[PDB]
Amino acid sequence: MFAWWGRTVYQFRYIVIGVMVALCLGGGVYGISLGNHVTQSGFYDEGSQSVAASLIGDEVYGRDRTSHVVAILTPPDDKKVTDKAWQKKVTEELDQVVKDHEDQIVGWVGWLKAPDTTDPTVSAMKTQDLRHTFISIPLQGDDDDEILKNYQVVEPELQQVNGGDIRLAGLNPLASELTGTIGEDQKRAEVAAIPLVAVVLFFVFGTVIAAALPAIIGGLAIAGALGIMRLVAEFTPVHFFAQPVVTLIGLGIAIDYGLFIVSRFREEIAEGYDTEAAVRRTVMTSGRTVVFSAVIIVASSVPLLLFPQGFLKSITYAIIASVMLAAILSITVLAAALAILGPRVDALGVTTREEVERGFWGRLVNVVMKRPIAFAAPILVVMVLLIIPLGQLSLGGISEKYLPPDNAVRQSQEQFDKLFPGFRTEPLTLVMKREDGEPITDAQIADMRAKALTVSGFTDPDNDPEKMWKERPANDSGSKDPSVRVIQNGLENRNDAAKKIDELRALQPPHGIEVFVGGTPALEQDSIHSLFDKLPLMALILIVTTTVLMFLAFGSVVLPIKAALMSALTLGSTMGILTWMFVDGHGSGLMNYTPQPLMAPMIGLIIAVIWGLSTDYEVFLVSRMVEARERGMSTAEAIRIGTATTGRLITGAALILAVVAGAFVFSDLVMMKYLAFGLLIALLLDATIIRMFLVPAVMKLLGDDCWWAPRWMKRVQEKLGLGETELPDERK
Numbered sequence: 001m002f003a004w005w006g007r008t009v010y011q012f013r014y015i016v017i018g019v020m021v022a023l024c025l026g027g028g029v030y031g032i033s034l035g036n037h038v039t040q041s042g043f044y045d046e047g048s049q050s051v052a053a054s055l056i057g058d059e060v061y062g063r064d065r066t067s068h069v070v071a072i073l074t075p076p077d078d079k080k081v082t083d084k085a086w087q088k089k090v091t092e093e094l095d096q097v098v099k100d101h102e103d104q105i106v107g108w109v110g111w112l113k114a115p116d117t118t119d120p121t122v123s124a125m126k127t128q129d130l131r132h133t134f135i136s137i138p139l140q141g142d143d144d145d146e147i148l149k150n151y152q153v154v155e156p157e158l159q160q161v162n163g164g165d166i167r168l169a170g171l172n173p174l175a176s177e178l179t180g181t182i183g184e185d186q187k188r189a190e191v192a193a194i195p196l197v198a199v200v201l202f203f204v205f206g207t208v209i210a211a212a213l214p215a216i217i218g219g220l221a222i223a224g225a226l227g228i229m230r231l232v233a234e235f236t237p238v239h240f241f242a243q244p245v246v247t248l249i250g251l252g253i254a255i256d257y258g259l260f261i262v263s264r265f266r267e268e269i270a271e272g273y274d275t276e277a278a279v280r281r282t283v284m285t286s287g288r289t290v291v292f293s294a295v296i297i298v299a300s301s302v303p304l305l306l307f308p309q310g311f312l313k314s315i316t317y318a319i320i321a322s323v324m325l326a327a328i329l330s331i332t333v334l335a336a337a338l339a340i341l342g343p344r345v346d347a348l349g350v351t352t353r354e355e356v357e358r359g360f361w362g363r364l365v366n367v368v369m370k371r372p373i374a375f376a377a378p379i380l381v382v383m384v385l386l387i388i389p390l391g392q393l394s395l396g397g398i399s400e401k402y403l404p405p406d407n408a409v410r411q412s413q414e415q416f417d418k419l420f421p422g423f424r425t426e427p428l429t430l431v432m433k434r435e436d437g438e439p440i441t442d443a444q445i446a447d448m449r450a451k452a453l454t455v456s457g458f459t460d461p462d463n464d465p466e467k468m469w470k471e472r473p474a475n476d477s478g479s480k481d482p483s484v485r486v487i488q489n490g491l492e493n494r495n496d497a498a499k500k501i502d503e504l505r506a507l508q509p510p511h512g513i514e515v516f517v518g519g520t521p522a523l524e525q526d527s528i529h530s531l532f533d534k535l536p537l538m539a540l541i542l543i544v545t546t547t548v549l550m551f552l553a554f555g556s557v558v559l560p561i562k563a564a565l566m567s568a569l570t571l572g573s574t575m576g577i578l579t580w581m582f583v584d585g586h587g588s589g590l591m592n593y594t595p596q597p598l599m600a601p602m603i604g605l606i607i608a609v610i611w612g613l614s615t616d617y618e619v620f621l622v623s624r625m626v627e628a629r630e631r632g633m634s635t636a637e638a639i640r641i642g643t644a645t646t647g648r649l650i651t652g653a654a655l656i657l658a659v660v661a662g663a664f665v666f667s668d669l670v671m672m673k674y675l676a677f678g679l680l681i682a683l684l685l686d687a688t689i690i691r692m693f694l695v696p697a698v699m700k701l702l703g704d705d706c707w708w709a710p711r712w713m714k715r716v717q718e719k720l721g722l723g724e725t726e727l728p729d730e731r732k
């Protein structure tokens with residue numbers, strides 16, 4: 001199968017370069033417009049009750065646009081807000097930007113619009129010392145994405161009022177700053193990561209052309225991957241986070257895939273094979289290894305589709321499209337480029353000891369295999385102790401804390417929450433709905449409200465139980481159906497969300513009406529629950545599919561079960577350190593972030609990426625161990641030769657993916673630091689502790705058992721065209 005494709009990619013080398021590059025280049029220009037068709041929601045279980053409570057509530061009471069923008073206005077020269085001359089100056093500036101942007105702004109609302117008023121909440125829009133006052137600027141739009149795109153049209157002119165002294169906070173100033181970290185992370189990779197991976201590529205090949213090919217394949221991969229997702233956006237929504245994942249993960253392992261193809265090609269050239277025979281032996285070995293490695297990551301990402309979070313679904317599609325296009329380009333464009341170029345892939349040089357490290361790998365493995373229990377036992381018990389911090393796992397939602405504490409937009413929100421306490425609330429909603437269609441009586445409301453007061457832990461700023469669980473305000477865009485009435489109240493502690501939500505759902509609603517418990521604490525706790533309910537079924541599918549794929553890439557049954565254990569150990573040890581640094585705070589003062597509960601759908605993603613990544617690096621290693629073993633060599637020889645003919649490649653393939661990960665660990669977005677650190681930690685763990693010690697030690701204990709497989713299972717692999725674990729007699 002790969003032997004057949006090895007020679008066909010040489011006979012049609014000119015057209016597979018022309019056609020496949022054209023598709024990858026066509027998707028690039030078609031993918032430039034991808035940033036204009038992305039959404040920000042998908043963190044909640046869309047088929048849950050808290051979401052239903054939000055759909056019903058917005059349909060009846062209307063969407064709330066009061067929290068879109070809150071602008072803190074401060075008069076210069078210590079003037080008080082009662083300065084009539086200053087009020088006239090800023091109101092005209094506000095009336096001016098609304099006049100110029102009627103299509104983006106509904107209007108502005110606040111104490112300035114009525115300085116002499118008797119409304120308490122409007123009079124609370126000013127501080128007791130008359131030095132600050134805030135306004136609400138509701139924005140136009142039918143969904144949260146159109147609203148945010150309207151705030152970004154007016155923010156510069158809005159920021160210029162009051163001599164520039166205006167603090168913008170609320171839902172949209174933060175969302176602009178959160179989604180803006182994406183571009184900050186891309187530009188940081190284009191000026192700091194892609195130059196670093198250029199000098200890493202040159203120190204493995206010594207010539208510019210051999211080093212430039214994996215980068216070209218990686219560029220063609222993301223170019224064609226951004227085009228695939230732009231086509232996906234024509235049918236279903238896609239999230240903003242799916243663009244960095246293509247750069248953070250797809251661009252990294254695509255260069256890794258293109259690395260084993262070019263290295264194996266130069267290896268066959270030095271052995272004395274001609275250009276056609278070389279590209280066929282790489283496809284039978286590295287090309288086969290890369291295809292298996294790509295399908296494994298796919299098998300690591302599809303179980304996330306069991307999870308109902310659309311944020312996850314959009315990301316799996318980006319991982320699938322990036323790793324598969326990478327493998328396809330590796331055995332098409334790259335394999336044919338090596339066929340056209342040939343040994344003048346080593347021609348140019350930098351002007352335009354490789355055998356001594358390969359011996360150091362042999363010496364280290366012989367030390368490991370000589371006293372293996374002295375290496376396996378201390379390593380695996382240390383990794384188990386690194387899983388202990390995972391017991392302190394807490395889960396939360398998005399807030400202004402996802403930015404560094406020195407972020408101006410975050411500070412403007414925190415300044416609002418201390419000058420004007422009471423306006424910012426996260427209430428749990430009791431959405432009452434009658435199936436009669438008849439109005440809900442005032443007694444039905446006071447009855448459901450009386451049951452909500454039997455549940456402690458709810459906010460009471462007035463110090464009166466009669467003022468608790470008020471009705472939600474009715475905006476002028478909602479159909480005031482008296483069949484549906486909702487009452488809401490916030491919590492004294494967010495940590496009581498899961499507890500108090502269950503206490504509200506346990507209340508017996510009035511005879512005819514049915515109650516839906518919603519609010520952002522309910523939305524968060526329902527996405528948490530949906531992940532950890534299908535997390536075991538996800539892990540079951542994740543493990544059995546990756547294991548059988550390695551049984552085909554290799555020829556053994558115990559080797560895939562070994563790697564699964566070494567991948568589970570690397571997983572738990574990596575997530576325990578992350579819980580130790582992003583939840584408990586160890587490393588927050590240096591990396592500039594605040595420890596806080598994690599986004600629950602993000603632990604599902606980090607499980608998928610780390611697993612498929614650690615398995616891929618096991619496939620890169622053992623593929624040469626089995627290939628040497630298939631030549632009749634002993635187990636200790638197959639091990640040594642395995643981790644010596646690839647000990648430099650796997651080392652180099654890890655630094656590249658670590659550099660691009662090291663560029664996202666500086667992201668102002670904290671959950672990107674969590675993801676990029678997870679790749680950085682697991683990469684170092686796999687490429688050093690696992691590869692150099694735990695793999696040779698455990699395989700030495702097993703001996704010839706390492707390669708064993710039942711016979712009725714080896715012929716199946718053989719039957720499919722996947723039994724090319726060993727090469728043919730060739731003369732060169």
Ligand SMILES: CCCCCCCCCCCCO[C@@H]1O[C@H](CO)[C@@H](O[C@H]2O[C@H](CO)[C@@H](O)[C@H](O)[C@H]2O)[C@H](O)[C@H]1O
Nearest residue numbers: 393394395396495498528529532533535536539597607
């Ligand atoms: C390959 C890996 C396979 C791993 C298999 C994992 C199986 C499932 C693990 C436990 C499942 C239960 O999931 C449980 O959800 C509740 C929801 O409150 C979490 O509760 C935790 O988070 C929520 C939200 O902050 C709150 O309860 C509180 O922060 C904390 O107690 C528990 O921490 C978690 O244990």
